[PDB]
Amino acid sequence: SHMMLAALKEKLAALKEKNAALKYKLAALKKHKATPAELAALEKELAATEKELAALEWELAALEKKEPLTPELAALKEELAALKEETAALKYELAAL
């Protein structure tokens, strides 16, 4: 196995746990009406996830250039596309607070 895969798999798992922590941050803010600073804080955390997902596409892209026949290449591209759609769904939910 490649260390390019394991480092990519760990980052895909950590960003899935960062999205789940963002879900719980939304739930708490549906209770307390929240200040603009707290609303701007969850938004800045949302933009940080979009940046990490965008650089991960380049990370996965460098792996395809040096090893296009590596197994899990299709599942890693689909897992990143799901994380991007999951992050965007948290953006629309926040915009209604």
Author numbering: -2 to 94
Sentences from the paper on this structure:
To do this here, we used MASTER to search the RCSB PDB for loops to connect helices in the AF2 models for the clockwise, apCCTri-BĀN, and anticlockwise, apCCTri-BĀN′, topologies. We solved X-ray crystal structures at 2.10 Å, 2.15 Å and 2.20 Å resolution for the two BĀN- and one BĀN′-based designs, respectively. All had consolidated hydrophobic cores with knobs-into-holes packing between the core Leu residues confirmed by Socket2.
Here we describe the combination of rational and computational design to deliver three-helix bundle (3HB) peptide assemblies and single-chain proteins with control over topology and thermal stability. This gives core-packing rules, including layers of hydrogen-bonded polar residues, which are combined with surface-charge patterning to design complementary sequences for acidic (A), basic (B), and neutral (N) helices. Synthetic genes for these express in E. coli to yield soluble, monomeric, and thermally stable proteins.
